[model samples]
Target chain A: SDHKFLTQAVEEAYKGVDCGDGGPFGAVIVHNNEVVASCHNMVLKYTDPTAHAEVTAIREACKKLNKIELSECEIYASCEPCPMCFGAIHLSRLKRLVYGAKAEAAIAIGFDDFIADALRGTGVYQKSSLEIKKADGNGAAIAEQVFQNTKEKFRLY
Target chain B: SDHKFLTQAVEEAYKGVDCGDGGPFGAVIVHNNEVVASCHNMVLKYTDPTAHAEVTAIREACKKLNKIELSECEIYASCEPCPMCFGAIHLSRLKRLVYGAKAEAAIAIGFDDFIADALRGTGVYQKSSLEIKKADGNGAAIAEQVFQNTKEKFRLY
Candidate 1:
């Protein structure tokens, strides 16, 4: 079920990498099992470091819904949510999160006390209302492969 | 010095209020004593929660500067940086931050265990490299009044 959707995000990442739009990350938000919006990292395109895949998708979804909060929505991402995106998730009122890749390497290099504290509060951040899961299939493996392939080209985080 | 830049941001906020567009917040970024970019909140138009005045200005500045890291840059904001904007600030590598008004009310309503930890690390977040200060003049008073006038209309934060 969730694996299928995560695979979609992996394919979107494929497009992003080939297109050189930005980081090879993708995210899709779903409500009632239908996609509200799908987006990739727009940092380079928009020149905003905060324009990660999750943030871009969240922004697009908010526009479509004409509201700020996404109470019954879920986001599927190609990689684990960064601290900034985690803060975005808390603010957007998302109900569920699924990621195809762990993103441990990026997190390991950047996680300081502040960001670490932000991650520690993931559960309590939404007061246990948000459900988070990792894909247990090829989606995770392929997503990891996409990132590893791109990161090998240079010091891309 | 910094207040002059922040006062520019304050005037931008006044325009934003008079135009009835988005939050009455504004921000400007300076480098080598010249303006890189100036922006007011575009959340209502962009429908993005992360599009605070500071974030918008940071994004615009990054675009103009053609770099992600603002090594020697300074940001003058109409209100204190929010946690999410602080995350953006930390990620953007800003060297200094000046806010005209304290965003204590917004912080009080939303600050939780996670956000509190985020605020606690503001100093070390940049390894003491980032300089932060509040305007000690009429800019702060005007900024506060602008926020007070708007927040009374509804739960803006």
Candidate 2:
């Protein structure tokens, strides 16, 4: 079911690659087994460097729930989050995180990679008490393909 | 009038301290020397970790202009920005950045410190072509005082 959630995120990532909206990344927030919000990278669309897939999804999730604290929520993302994305996660009070692929996919596309273990060791992350893991699914292949297509088309990374 | 603009940010930061809102930080965006968007930290208030002063001001400035590219604008902030905030700046296309106080004040309050020179060396910063500098004024004192007052009030850090 978590893999299914990641598939939704992959679908959003595909839209970014198809429309040149942003980098080939996407995120979905799930709560109590319900996929509440999904978003793709909007860095280029909104001129908001902070509008990564995770950020957009988090914002929408908050708005949907009418609350800022998502203590029981989970996030599924297409690629490993960058430092800025992880920093946001550190404060979201989210319970768990599952990435479709590893940092290697993003790195292969010319993006700088951040170590998740180091961030997970931070005081803020410790305070947040999140469960971080990586999983495999059909969506991972699509995520890789999206990166390849993005690299060939724009080479922004 | 950069000092004056920074005072506006400082006032917002003080409000956060006075109201027990979030943190001792604030930010303002200036375009064509006109004081535009102003915001303070809302991390605790909103339960959103990414709701820093810089991010809020950047969002508002883009909304006010109905455009995301702030190529000719500048930001005046109460304290040095964190990595996430700096990442947003790396994409905002803002021409210059002026900070009221140094990172030392925030670090003194047990906050993690990021080096601006190190961030300036990033490829993203190079692409943004921003003029970054630290400035001193009466506002800087208030910024520092806010940090002190905040530390005394909440021993979170």
Candidate 3:
């Protein structure tokens, strides 16, 4: 509901753009299945030099939520952010975690690895029970396009 | 004209895709003004993930070239391949020079450092002779859609 919050969140997510995922990761925050805020990261290169860019996208979405003055908010992404990104959410002091499809599944699989290495207590959130099958398609598609384009753009011999 | 060559190169570039320009560290090879090959030495986790991937693409492209009977062909990429790829090119008797865009041209300028610090004598090519404009509008446009669709598919938040 806050313009500043939504705009800021969108802008911040843009920084996470990478070539592999096609750009910054995309997101659509839903509260009770109503789209609240949404954003898609755009790519400016063949690869994202920084892997944390996807996390940046999530952080931006989180930023948008801050402006609504909601006491609590939940976030969903196509992919689980890297450790740095996970740390950012923890640092942002938000609540609620539910990502679409593969992201949540990946998160579940990666939780132990991340927790064992980069993640610690308080940074981990309990994700929502519902997992959308479609969430990973976007990020994965971008990743696929990234592969396709990079191939065509640089095809050799 | 060699479809196999094209497909292999495309695969390599996409495999280690980094659509974000961390610093403009991509290499390209042109034969008769048509780009024949290119690569980028992308940094992942602060390491050269792009270089390895690009090399893999180039190697496969070269193999395709050989399979199709193209000899002594030149290849270009956004960045230099690592030792393995470089060695592959060398052993194959390929005369290729890798080059990176001037730091001023792209966001992935940090890649220049990776190229500079790692590449050595006669085997590698880094170009200041040409400056690659931003990806053609078509590439950019498609890239945008890919991200959008990917998000829709993945249901990223």
Top candidate, metric TM-score: 1
lDDT of 2 by residue, A1-157 (tens): 8778888888888887678888888999999898888899987788666788998888888878877767889998888776566656655667888887777777777775443332444332122346887775466676666677767755353
Candidate 1 chain A — worst ten consecutive residues by lDDT sum? A119-128
The TM-score that candidate 3 achieves is 0.27
Please give the ranking of all candidate structures by TM-score, highest first, separated by commas: 1, 2, 3
What TM value does chain A in model 2 reach? 0.86
* Candidate 3 CAPRI-style tier: incorrect
TM-score of chain B of each: 0.81, 0.86, 0.36
Tens digits of per-residue lDDT, candidate 3, A43-82, equal 2232222223333334344455444122244445444443
Better of 1 and 3 by TM-score: 1
Per-residue lDDT over B1-157 for candidate 2, one digit per residue giving the tens place of the 0 to 100 score: 7778788888888887667667778999998888778898876676566788998888888888877678879998888776567657765767888887778888788876443332444332123357877776566677677777777664241
Better of 1 and 2 by lDDT: 2
Specify the poorest-scoring 10-residue window by lDDT in model 2 chain B.
Answer: B118-127
The lDDT of model 2 is 0.74
Regions of model 3 farther than 4 Å from truth: A1-21, A31-34, A43-59, A62-71, A100-157, B1-157
User: 1 or 3: which has the higher lDDT?
Assistant: 1
DockQ of candidate 2, scored on C-alphas against the true complex (2 decimals): 0.26
Question: lDDT tens string, model 1, B1-157?
Answer: 7768888898877666566556677899999899998888776667687787888888889988888778799999887776567677877889888887766634443333333234334332222346778776677777777655665433353
Worst 10 residues of 2 chain A by lDDT: A118-127
Candidates in order, TM-scores: namely 0.82, 0.75, 0.27
Ten-residue stretch with the least lDDT total in model 1 chain B: B119-128
- How would you encode candidate 3's per-residue C-alpha lDDT over B1-157 as one tens digit per residue? 2223333333333443445422223333334545555554343322222234344334344443434211345544433333333333332333544332222232132112111211342211211222223233333333223322322221111
